[PDB]
Design a protein around this ligand. Structure first.
Ligand code: A1LX0
Ligand code: A1LX0
Ligand code: ADP
Ligand code: ADP
Ligand code: MG
Ligand code: MG
Lengths: 530, 532
């Protein structure tokens, strides 16, 4: 019994529990749409820009915990998505990008939007920022390739995949071979027992242990065993800026965020070296996460690091025990072994109004810009994984679009995006797609009339010698929401903001809130990095 | 022995190449570059709303400039956004220089903020397949030589884009003043052999039914005058490729229109009938849309001549009898010398008509990708050389939307109009804010048919409408979108509101947008042809 090669790929994608595919169609990429629409199990989402779809697939992935899928046509369709694929690459999230190719009969001829080595070579443009980038050579090889793709995206440190599909093979017949995921993909690695008992032994003798939880806690879905491990051990837990959300910040053992725009209940504990035992679980230990690799973060006795990627272990700090394993399989073993022992408006208040009204289960997406300083510092996130910030690449526009995918992945939970205005101008057009698909998301535009943080570097680094930051005319984001069919609120006092915010969440449809913000307000954590 | 920072010397040499703007968005590590431009007071920076628009602006400026276009973007996502614009510069053979930041060397491999090395997001290797050169500045001293290498590479041979990556720490290291005029580090252009020019001369002399196919290469060589003098001196008719529309006056007696996609029956019949004996191809790559999917009937009976500055294009899809590797302007000047010395809603079809009946003769017309290509290429008549700007090499949606702003910065005292689809404007539509900011009078004509016109036509004409991925449930309102960005706008539901709107647009000398309601089921010209 046969199917068309591209028909078998969606059926294999169905088996991975992929529910939506975001993208923009094209001549050579239509065979895929006729296939997704033949099955009616997976649904296609038409976006306004291919980076917006990629950003959505990434957003769907991180909250879904499943594989994100986006599609694009030959050439510029594909190149458009790149920045989103580059963010999925730096945040360790499994995104599969499907791109079309011209038929082999036109290779080297100057085909329309040719994406081979002879034209715009997608597979090598996309290699440095994917776990795998490959053109399917034959129809017959579609099953084994797409299982190769799904296996690579969600094993090890997860990441994005680029699959290039020549339009001609897309409808060649092939045998129907669809497998459940666990038949062609392995499980995760656990720590050796020798290391589990050595750090158990280091915790038992510690005068001041501390845990630094990074983004790996979310990819490992390790919140519960982290919460049980901290509670059982009594060790205080700090998050990276990107790892905020991975431990409840209301909890007695919570020190908040360590690093950029962080809290100094974390700074002192972790930086004023009383610390002797440091357990780093699922963090790159990059710039922001370490306060520019401050040598004072190193503990006096032992540094322990758990990470599913061996190459990150001991990269910037010498480790005493380096565990190459899943954070969730490591922690349950650790608990198993220790219980076995038995012995305008000021942004500060716009976050303030948000904390007083967003439901407990609100997923908060934050963009890149001064909104990260406000988001990481002043919002307290109590629900596991409910704080969504893309600090891997820190691309402006990320959450503006990301969030749409997040609410498709968690439709019964409220989803809110806190974004800057220049970021909204880069990807704000995708509120039209939420409008078209009736995806109720609330964007909170922190409108300071330009590039907030760049304005501050000018003043504080090149003594107001020039201005490349401010606008001469602020954008009108409520008129813009109106053009895109989205209900809108303007707020220039705190209480207009609160009225807007509780109207939006009642609203059952997309909504945008345009907040007046002074471009000179110095965000938390910006004067320390200067 | 005057010393200056490397980034000042980069700017100073760019000044020598006549670049007048740098399009981009600032960032932490890229701020030294902006500090340099503002202290020098010559080149001016344009802050755009997306870096892809900045690269679109630089491509448009270069194409109208005849000079080098420059954009800048920061580490990581800054540069990746610009990719599609650089890939467009690469497929249309436009000299664009994209300057991108790199974190300081002391943070390589450490996980620095938006690290764009081999250890992070590899800018130099991402940009390698769609640039003539992509290289990270290794040291401060090599800024002079690497910047002179980029200008020579971008504007020599077949022109194309360049990627220069600059580590943020070496930007501010002092280097010796070392600035040269453009003709001390780049060569001139190649001419044909005397042997081949007289061999082509002697073929046209004996040709019964010769024909010329003029492609985009005529604009890159700045060869319009001698192409018209070559056709006039020889009496042989001129057809263009769809992308070369503005290279041969269509109001001339010898003009054949466009041959290929959405072309004219005049051009197809002469070149495909089977009565041509000598065909000269000047500057076209002879790809799909340039040759009706490589119809073998384009082969001439006697001799095919191909002229092209890139040798690897000669005879690629059709066998040539004379293959000249030379610049098109120097070839045409030699052939003329050697023969003279010899001595012996609204229907879009009526929207562009309203446009041609009203727009000045010197208007530079930008067209985006979508049905506007069928309407622009087929129904618009272009009489001015280079006055039609369409990026058909990559055919990236949204290209004309932003590029026209760069075009009008390059030709400030000529009218510039962009004819774009509604989905195209939705991806890069927000750049009009940049035009409102800098007071750049461009007129956008949005053919708003409420979704993806040609894809909807594919559904009907290849999937029998088994599905709809093409129309939006709610047409976007582009006059409200214009208004919120500070741009004057007009809506048109009649043909006359369009004529009133367009005539208002041109008088105002400010940015303006005209939102035209169009039926999405209208079959554009040349779309019937392309279905099989
Ligand atoms: C795609 C992309 N292109 C450029 C940047 C660089 N970049 C910022 C970085 O974080 C570092 C802060 C110095 C560089 S920040 C910021 C202004 C945001 O302006 P807005 O959106 O309005 O936010 P705000 O006004 O609240 O500051 C910009 C442009 C980026 N990150 N991504
Ligand atoms: C960046 C980018 N992403 C996708 C495409 C594919 N694509 C077109 C190509 O040429 C081929 C013709 C079918 C594929 S065309 C068109 C819609 C026009 O929508 P509009 O702007 O409204 O134009 P129109 O209404 O007249 O059809 C689209 C989406 C593209 N080119 N670039
Ligand atoms: N399932 C997992 N278990 C443990 N660690 C993981 C897992 N998945 C990813 N990681 C690790 O988490 C780290 C996340 O680092 P990054 O994405 O830079 O976050 P942060 O900046 O918060 O440290 C990476 O080093 C990655 O190898
Ligand atoms: N200065 C020049 N003189 C002559 N030909 C050129 C010059 N610059 C570029 N070309 C050629 O013009 C061609 C442009 O092709 P393309 O971009 O596909 O336009 P079209 O579709 O009209 O062929 C390329 O083959 C290139 O080698
Ligand atoms: Mg702002
Ligand atoms: Mg349209």
């Amino acid at each position: 019994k046969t199917v068309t090669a591209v028909e078998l790929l969606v059926r294999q994608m169905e088996a991975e529990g992929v529910s939506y595919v975001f993208g923009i169609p094209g001549g050579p990429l239509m065979p895929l749409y006729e296939a997704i629409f033949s099955r009616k199990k997976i649904q296609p989402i038409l976006t306004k820009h291919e980076e917006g779809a990629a950003f959505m697939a990434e957003g769907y992935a991180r909250v879904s915990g499943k594989l994100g899928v986006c599609c694009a046509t030959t050439g510029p369709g594909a190149t458009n998505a790149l920045t989103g694929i580059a963010c999925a690459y730096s945040d360790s999230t499994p995104v599969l990008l499907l791109t079309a190719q011209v038929g082999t009969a036109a290779f080297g001829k100057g085909a329309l939007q040719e994406s081979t080595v002879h034209g715009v070579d997608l597979v090598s443009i996309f290699s440095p920022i994917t776990k795998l980038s490959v053109m399917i050579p034959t129809a017959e090889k579609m099953g084994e390739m797409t299982r190769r793709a799904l296996r690579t995206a969600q094993s090890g440190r997860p990441g994005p995949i680029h699959l290039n599909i020549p339009a001609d093979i897309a409808k060649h017949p092939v045998p129907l071979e669809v497998f459940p995921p666990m038949n062609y993909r392995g499980g995760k690695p656990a720590p050796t027992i020798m290391d589990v008992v050595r750090v158990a032994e280091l915790i038992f003798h510690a005068k001041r242990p501390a845990i630094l939880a990074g983004h790996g806690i979310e990819c490992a879905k390790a919140w519960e065993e982290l919460l049980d491990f901290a509670e059982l051990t009594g060790i205080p837990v700090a998050t990276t800026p990107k790892g905020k959300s991975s431990f409840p910040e209301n909890h007695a053992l919570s020190l908040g965020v360590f690093g950029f725009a962080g809290h100094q209940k974390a700074t002192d504990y972790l930086l004023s070296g009383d610390v002797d035992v440091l357990i780093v679980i699922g963090s790159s230990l990059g710039d922001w996460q370490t306060n520019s690799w401050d040598p004072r973060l190193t503990p006096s006795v032992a540094l322990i690091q758990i990470d599913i990627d061996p190459m990150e272990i001991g990269k910037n700090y010498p480790v005493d025990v380096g565990i190459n394993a899943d954070a969730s399989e490591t922690l349950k073993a650790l608990i198993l072994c220790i219980r076995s022992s038995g012995k305008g408006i000021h942004p500060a208040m716009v976050v303030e109004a948000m904390q007083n009204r967003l439901p407990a289960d609100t997923i908060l997406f934050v963009d890149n810009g001064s909104c990260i300083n406000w988001g990481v510092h002043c919002y307290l996130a109590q629900t596991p994984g409910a704080f969504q910030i893309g600090l891997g690449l820190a691309a402006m526009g990320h959450a503006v679009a990301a969030a749409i995918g997040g609410k498709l992945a968690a439709p019964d939970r409220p989803v809110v995006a806190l974004v800057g205005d220049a970021a909204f101008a880069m990807n704000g057009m995708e509120i039209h797609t939420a409008a078209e698909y009736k995806i109720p998301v609330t964007w909170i535009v922190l409108n300071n009339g330009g590039h907030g943080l760049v304005h501050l570097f000018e003043q504080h680094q090149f003594d107001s010698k020039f201005d490349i930051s401010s606008f001469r005319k602020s954008i009108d984001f409520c008129k813009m929401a109106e053009s895109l069919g989205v209900k809108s609120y303007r707020a220039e006092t705190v209480e207009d903001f609160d009225a807007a915010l509780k109207g939006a969440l009642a609203m059952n449809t997309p909504c945008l809130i345009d907040v007046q913000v002074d471009i000179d307000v110095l965000p938390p954590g910006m004067k320390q990095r200067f």
